Design a protein around this nucleic acid. Sequence first.
DNA 1: CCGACGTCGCATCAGC
DNA 2: GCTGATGCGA
DNA 3: GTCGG
Length: 321
Amino acid sequence: LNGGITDMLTELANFEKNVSQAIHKYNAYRKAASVIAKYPHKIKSGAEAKKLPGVGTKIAEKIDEFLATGKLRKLEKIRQDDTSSSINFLTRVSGIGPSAARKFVDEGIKTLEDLRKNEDKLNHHQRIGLKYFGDFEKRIPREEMLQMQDIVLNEVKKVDSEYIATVCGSFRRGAESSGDMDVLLTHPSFTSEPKLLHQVVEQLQKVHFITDTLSKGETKFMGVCQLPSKNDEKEYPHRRIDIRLIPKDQYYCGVLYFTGSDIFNKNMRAHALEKGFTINEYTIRPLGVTGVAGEPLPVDSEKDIFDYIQWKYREPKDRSE
DNA sequence: CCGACGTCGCATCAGC
DNA sequence: GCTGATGCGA
DNA sequence: GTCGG
Ligand code: NA
Ligand code: NA
């Protein structure tokens, strides 16, 4: 419908983030693309688009040029710019952000082939990113996520039967494919007021599900994993997996949040204000008359939170908005 | 006109 | 060596 | 770049 326009805007968004280092303009272009992607008519003028929340003057001007000519002069130029297109491209490697990519490109390093010739100039994280460059840009079909979940719930339970683990993200909401796996972990010995994460990571490296580590501390693990290769069949791609340990009395707040979607969370947080509650990723708190937040309220399920705000429990499946 | 635009854990850097 | 800033991804 | 106090 408006694929032309939203690829244009998404492409422009990337140059802002990666080359210009203008994070807010990146987010403006993305938000403009989203609204346009949802617009159920083929757009005829920038004026038509400007009416949508997140489309201003400059993007209207650009939509008009694209409609009249089928291209954007600035984008054509940017796209053919040797420096910018390389900087933009290197940020596709996980761990190479806009600043490292600018440095690489300053000293001549432009391509994966170049990154490969200069491993010693990469931190740990960036090497992993480079190694799994193709695998990381693949999506993960739901089927494989169920298999991955099977493994993670098994090996958690097998470390200590009292752990609670939940695979969140769009997967929890029923999505047909995911970008990564987001695992939220908790245990009744850990509240707000030991080795609980290391032990679980250890078990998953021990049965060869976890294959690499990006980062790991007391509360959050970022790394890589892979389903076991079925007899003589082709090996599965390597996948991104995060695991976070969350205090028991903040866990359901964490699950609700990390399940999303972003839009859904936005609605609920708003609805929660007008009902006198502040909900962050951690806690739900009451708001006194002058706007001052009281003690985090006890939460023992996702549902407890909905109750607090006089809303009816909605399944992850329908938390689309 | 002009500031907000999310916030934070971890790894690694810059400064002392 | 320690502490805070910054880059990064989410 | 867009919005809104
Ligand atoms: Na507008
Ligand atoms: Na990157």
